[PDB]
């Protein structure tokens, strides 16, 4: 064959598996995995093919229990990745984009939200256009102005909610992990896949304004507001398509 | 209006489990997600969380619970449930079922201060 | 990630003395306080859902002051029936925390 199949060093591989994990989360769109199925073979000793690392996400992020190695393996008590870490996360980073996502405790802290199971459709309801940050009553978005007056950072409690964003550069912060997103259109988050789709319990949107990439950068999404039924009662929450102006 | 009613054990042996219950009546929750949780507070001491569903479906626990813990809401019988495990003396407390009924995220409808005992 | 402090960790009045109590917070939060006036041994009940707004069940006696990390609770005239515990509880990021409490008690 014309095609030389490529061996990547380790350091080459590691990239290139993380970048593969990172795919399946979504939180990137490309994918290089030329060499990665020997990169395996040789320092792993088994084959990296999908259900194998639907299994690494799965344990690493959810199930896994005890010390995590950098290649997402674990162990309840010369050769690579033996020297399995506690540090409770992995910097996955692939070269081309990084992320830095936190292990896997299981019941100890906030949880995550199986959108197989749930799926919350709000209805639509007429209001306000534009929003001010400053007064957002919205019970999916919470905002924070700090003293510099520079920075800004929306806390997004109900993830199932999508926010898209336009013209800017942010960071997300959640349980999960952790990193920038400079492209417009729906907040990508880490989808992991459980017997279901599992995402984030919540997520933080840090806006940066002290640097001028965030000029004119402004977020569309649901306000969610918790109205009264007129027929019957009790509480049926609504949305509204709504704008939030930042730059 | 809305009404509860913490009706669990008021007594376990230790590495026991917890079956607290907290029925809601004057609503159902098949009618829309309702923020609640359960909140503790030991003798003594301030307000503690359990345990807690935000309109996400977003299950939270208190990490000092060691992950003991476990919500659960139940829609079909319009009721709430705690499941701790390993019961332990420590955890000697009162305990409140709260919802969100209105305003967006604060606790108006506290249940009754039920309480468990956890000794020998 | 927020936590809470409370200032008086008791203060004591008489019947008709206008008090305060503050809570402030690590972060800044915009709004987003609760109070609940907790009696001992009952349940607590929610006084304030919002800096300055007022749940309808209580009395008008009560009112909330101030924005961003700092906020305080007002009592225009304190009455016998105050005699409780006063939390804070912060609303910008789940675990709703609360503070620790001050005890407001009646001198005579």
């Known amino acids: 064959n014309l095609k030389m199949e490529i061996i990547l060093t380790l350091s080459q591989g590691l990239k290139k598996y993380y970048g593969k994990i990172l795919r399946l989360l979504q939180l990137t769109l490309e994918e290089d995995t030329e060499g990665l199925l020997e990169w395996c073979k040789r320092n792993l000793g088994l084959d990296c093919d999908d259900t194998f690392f639907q299994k690494r996400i799965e344990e690493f992020f959810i199930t896994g229990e005890g010390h995590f190695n950098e290649v997402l393996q674990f162990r309840t008590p010369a050769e690579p990745f033996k020297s399995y870490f506690a540090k409770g996360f992995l910097s996955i980073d692939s070269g081309y984009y990084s992320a830095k996502c936190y292990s896997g405790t299981s019941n100890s802290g906030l949880q995550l939200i199986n959108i197989t199971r749930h799926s919350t459709r709000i209805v639509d309801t007429p209001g306000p256009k534009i929003t001010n940050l400053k007064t957002i009553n919205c019970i999916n978005l919470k905002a924070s102005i700090f003293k510099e007056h520079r920075e800004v950072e929306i806390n997004v409690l109900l993830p199932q909610v999508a926010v898209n964003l336009s013209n800017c550069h942010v960071v997300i912060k959640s349980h999960v992990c952790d990193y920038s997103l400079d492209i417009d259109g729906a907040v990508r988050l880490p989808h992991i896949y459980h017997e279901g789709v599992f995402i984030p319990g919540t997520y933080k949107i840090v806006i940066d304004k002290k640097n001028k990439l965030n000029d004119r950068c402004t977020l569309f999404t649901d306000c969610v507001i918790k109205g009264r039924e007129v027929r019957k009662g009790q509480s049926v929450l609504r949305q509204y398509k709504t704008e939030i102006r930042i730059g | 209006q809305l009404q509860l009613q913490e009706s669990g054990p008021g007594l376990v042996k230790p590495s026991e489990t917890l079956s607290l219950t907290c029925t809601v009546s004057?609503?159902?929750?098949?009618?829309?997600?309702?923020?609640w949780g359960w909140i503790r507070q030991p003798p003594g001491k301030g307000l503690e969380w359990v345990g807690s569903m935000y309109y996400s479906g977003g299950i939270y626990y208190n990490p000092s619970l060691k992950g003991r813990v476990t919500i659960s809401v139940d829609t079909s019988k319009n009721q709430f449930s705690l499941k701790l495990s390993s019961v332990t003396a420590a955890d000697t407390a009162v305990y409140y079922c709260?919802?969100?009924?209105?305003?967006?995220?604060?606790?108006?409808?506290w249940g009754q201060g039920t309480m468990v005992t956890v000794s020998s | 990630d927020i936590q809470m402090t409370q200032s008086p960790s008791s203060l004591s009045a008489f019947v008709g003395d206008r008090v305060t109590i503050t809570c402030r917070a690590s972060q800044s939060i915009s709004s987003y306080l609760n109070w609940y006036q907790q009696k001992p041994g009952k349940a607590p009940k929610l006084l304030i859902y919002?800096?300055?707004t007022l749940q309808s069940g209580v009395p008008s006696r009560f009112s909330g002051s101030g924005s961003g990390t700092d906020f305080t609770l007002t009592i225009s005239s304190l009455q016998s029936e105050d005699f409780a515990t006063y939390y804070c509880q912060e609303s910008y990021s789940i675990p709703f925390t609360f503070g620790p409490g001050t005890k407001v008690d009646i001198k005579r």
């Open positions: 709260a919802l969100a009924d209105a305003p967006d995220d604060a606790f108006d409808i």
């Open positions: 919002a800096a300055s």
């Open positions: 004057g609503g159902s929750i098949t009618t829309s997600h309702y923020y």
